[PDB]
Write a protein that binds this DNA or RNA. Structure first.
Lengths: 53, 74
RNA sequence: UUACUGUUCCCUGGGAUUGGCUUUGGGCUUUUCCUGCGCAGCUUAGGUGGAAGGCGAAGAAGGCCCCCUUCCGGGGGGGCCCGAGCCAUCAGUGAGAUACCACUCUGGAAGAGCUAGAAUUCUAACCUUGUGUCAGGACCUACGGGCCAAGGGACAUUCU
RNA sequence: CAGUGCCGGAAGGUCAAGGAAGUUGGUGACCUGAUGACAGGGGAGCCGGCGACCGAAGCCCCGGUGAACGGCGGCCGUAACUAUAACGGUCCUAAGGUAGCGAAAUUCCUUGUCGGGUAAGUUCCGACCCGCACGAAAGGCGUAACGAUCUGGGCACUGUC
RNA sequence: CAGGGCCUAAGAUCAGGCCGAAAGGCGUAGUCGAUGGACAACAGGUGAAUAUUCCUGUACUACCCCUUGUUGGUCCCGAGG
RNA sequence: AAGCGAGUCUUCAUAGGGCAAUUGUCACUGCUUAUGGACCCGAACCUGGGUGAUCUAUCCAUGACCAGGAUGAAGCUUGGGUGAAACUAAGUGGAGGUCCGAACCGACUGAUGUUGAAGAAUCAGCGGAUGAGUUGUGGUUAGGGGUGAAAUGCCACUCG
RNA sequence: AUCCCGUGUGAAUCAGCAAGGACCACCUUGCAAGGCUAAAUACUCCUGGGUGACCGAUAGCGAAGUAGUACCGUGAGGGA
RNA sequence: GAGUUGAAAAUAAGCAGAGAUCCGGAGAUUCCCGAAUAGGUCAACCUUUCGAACUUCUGCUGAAUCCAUGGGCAGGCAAGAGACAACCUGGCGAACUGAAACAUCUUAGUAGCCAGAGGAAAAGAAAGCAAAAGCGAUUCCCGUAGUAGCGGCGAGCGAA
């Protein structure tokens, strides 16, 4: 019935799957929370950091 | 209690209407749930008990805001 | 009680907690190529448009042969040989030149995308375990905290 | 193993929420004709309804399963005197009571017939059998021992008489 | 002599911990809980009502006081029992 | 109903019909109705909250008790027989939900009792009596619940 | 319709948003998801003042003297 | 402003105008149980180094990564913990009953139980009501209205 968020991110260290610290692949919500944010292996796309870095 | 630390989401008092319109009582309660969110400010996990709505909310709004709006940590 | 209406236990499907792949194939996509014997005929007339020059040495007509389709009428097509042409109102035909173009519908194939379906899969949250580990003035083989273990694995558990 | 239960199948059919191609309806900028009185069709968008197809278990369906729930049939004929039928024909179900026991804590009619016991016993024991309606783990049949058990006849003993 | 000042069984209450409309439920170390384990008194007198309690005689246990020494402690602890 | 209005609805219509074409009010006192326990007395019952295992029903801990006699198993040992036993007698041995029987526990027959001496006794008999036994002190289990060698019995003379 | 809640998706903010009894337009009102605030108001185990077409000894409080007493029940509780 | 040492009479000595008895405002003491509070506990008791646990404040500062922490340790101060007649708010929330039975409904969100607080509480300053006219935070009484409406369109409930 329903799909869940597919949330943009930006990286902090190379991904063995999608990109080497540059790409913006909208990973998944069930993925940013554990591997990406626990392991500090990603940063969420804040509109604040974008236009200042 | 079955009360979300981060929102007063209680169970719901709701009668389950049947097809003959026979109303039982059927207390109806939130899917607050055992997880362990990674509190960045300590680089470390904390084990919480979270109404999923509140889980979505921390993510949208960050964690520490939710924290002070309920005053929970440590 | 196999009377009526329901509740609970239990079983299943949808959503939430819920994630990595990399494939198989169902339904939409989007770019890559054949497809055609109403009859008057240069003769297996594809409809609809731009429509007077395209196509050539980043190398054709022609014949020597390979393959595939087939109504054995012929069609697409690799190789080599060849080396100065196959071409348009030139007339037929409801509709035009195999000069050429956008595609395209007649349908058919594939790498490209959505959401599923299925399959195995690993690891981050989940369940479970641990005489193991260290301690706080003492232990915690007094439940339990952190820590790494080892199984399990997005299934189960819970919530609707 | 017919019905039900349970188990294993689940190929096909019915199969809910839900998902969903379309389709439909309202509202509606601007549009259009008439005596008098007002409609109609209608961009967008916003709200509705119905919905092809998809949607698991379940049930239908298919097999195993009775120390799982339970059930175990009638009518009509013939044999060597007459009879009773060893044996046959018919509708039937899923099949038609096996072994043992039997008028039985189960037989109504019924103090059933017969034998023993008694002077005389509707009680009692042993048999026969038309078991109204016994019967195999709601077990069948029988058992030595045991019973403040129910039941019949004894000897001794007595105011029970 | 009996109990408490010692110990713990069944059980109870349980800090913290977990769970739950509220009360409260489950639960660990602890704390209580003896009907049990440790621990030291007998005879004879007296007398209206008490006596293994008062009296006489002889005993026993615990803590001090005195002497000589060793200087080495008591706890938490690991063991026998 | 819009509406019209001494009329209006029904209809082609007066037609024809239906209803209209007018009335007080306030209070006190009675009657009666309505809601309230509603004239008084009387149920078995239902639901919520709490108190109950000193009776009794299982269990747990920890103690205590069971006169007196009888029988006599298995084992073990001797007169023995079989490369090896298999069994016969003796003796020791002391078993048994064994035997007879007091305390103890409980209830079967009979009489007394039935305004009892006693809300189930007394008397004469009666069963068990080392066991699936009794009993003492502390505890455990609860009202659609507890416990139950199962009667729906017991849960403090009260229990479908 | 408004009004608060469980599950999941999950807007805009003033050339906006909500209400005006589905919904859509136009108009009118009010502008959410933060908080506080006196009075008029219901009450009596009580205190003070007053009143009674209220009782006056099985009535009035159950209680006109050691009345929640004696007594009864293990207990809650009953109760002269 | 005089006589007095509570009820009833002595009793024994007292006290008082160098204010007794007495009546007021403020004080002081207030053994033991009881929130009960030093620890246990069968309440008004025992053992006690004399004194809870929760906040708060000041200091020591476990665990892993001496990080940062929280937890623990201590010296602090002294504030919360109990009580309530009825009224109130919140959570949970029945049933007998009425419907001449009864499952929707009604008794009713009443009773009761738990949790707070006040002398009152709750509500409250407009994303309100209205209706081409106006209002202006809440809360109560009257009245609209037993009307509109809801309703096995039944019993009945009943606004603004």
């Amino acid at each position: 019935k329903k799909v869940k968020k597919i949330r943009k991110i930006i990286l902090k260290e190379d991904i063995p799957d999608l990109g080497k610290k540059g790409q913006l692949l909208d990973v998944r919500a069930g993925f940013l929370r554990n591997f990406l944010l626990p392991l500090g292996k990603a940063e969420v796309v804040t509109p604040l950091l974008l236009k200042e870095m | 209690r079955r009360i979300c630390p981060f929102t007063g989401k209680k169970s719901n008092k709701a009668n389950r209407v049947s097809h003959s319109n026979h109303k039982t009582k059927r207390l109806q309660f939130v899917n607050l749930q055992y997880k362990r969110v990674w509190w960045e400010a300590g680089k470390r996990f904390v084990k919480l008990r979270l109404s999923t709505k509140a889980l979505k909310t921390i993510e949208k709004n960050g964690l520490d805001a939710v924290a002070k709006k309920a005053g929970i940590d440590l």
